[PDB]
Amino acid sequence: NTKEAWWKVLWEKIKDFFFSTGKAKADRCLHEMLFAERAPTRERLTEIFFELKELACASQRDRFQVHNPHENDATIILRIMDQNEENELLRITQNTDTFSCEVMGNLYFLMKDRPDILKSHPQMTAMIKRRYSEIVDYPLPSTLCLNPAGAPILSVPLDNIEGYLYTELRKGHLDGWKAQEKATYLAAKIQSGIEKTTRILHHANISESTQQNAFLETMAMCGLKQLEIPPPHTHIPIEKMVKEVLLADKTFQAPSTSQSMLAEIVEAISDQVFHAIFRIDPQAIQKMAEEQLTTLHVRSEQ
């Protein structure tokens, strides 16, 4: 045994929360989370939390609770309680600029990341607050926070989006739309990555062939298949879904860079919503697609 003092004490108390093969995995989770060479990203922080919840038996799943203190959207906390709800075993808080984690009441770390979905825009900041959504069993983008340079901070909520899922809850039962959105969204991401890397690498003559080979190859690795002809129109995608709930607020500003800023906002919220649902990072996929294109190309060099 080479565990930490607070780890052994935590494990001895959480240990029985998981079945057979499940504890070896929940053990590596914890390790990545609090005892690795470095602290996880906040996004990776939240994932690990649910991998644990998902790994624990249903009996102990009510032990994994998440809420916004006094409905204070600016902050969110995830935690693992004890049987008699006697105190907190693991506490994770996430504010607007930092996030921390406590183990048995001990502060293990406070990291500071740079939440700004409008990175490509200097004179503009925008973050995304969020609250737990049991329809996806994960926190999802609750409200969008903007901070222009010349006007007060905007707090346009986006809780209407969760509705599109509740309305689909009882209908052609959303379980189906997930198979659609998953392929549509991801394949589109794979295509952007392709066209993107091709532009910057324009000086390199990357055949339209390789371009298609990469697209089919990454689609294959992800397992999904293309059958979007046509996209059963009676299906409102996440983008259109979010584009809606936005304009639904008198947010509408006439300063100027809109076609680019509004398209970015949308893409950031959609990605996260999407990630909230499928627990897949749409950007991670776009990257592996970009790497496929380059890897294939350098292969056709010989």
UniProtKB/Swiss-Prot annotation:
Domains throughout the protein, and not only the N-terminus, are required for secretion and translocation. Both N- and C-terminal domains are also required for formation of tubules. Residues 1-302 are annotated as: Interaction with host PLEKHM2. Belongs to the Sif family. It comes from Salmonella typhimurium (strain LT2 / SGSC1412 / ATCC 700720). GO terms for biological process: symbiont-mediated perturbation of host microtubule cytoskeleton; symbiont-mediated perturbation of host Rab small GTPase signal transduction; symbiont-mediated perturbation of host small GTPase-mediated signal transduction. It is found in: Secreted; Host cytoplasm; Host cell membrane. One of its GO terms (cellular component) is host cell cytoplasm. Keywords: Host cell membrane, Host cytoplasm, Host membrane, Membrane, Secreted, Virulence. This is Secreted effector protein SifA.
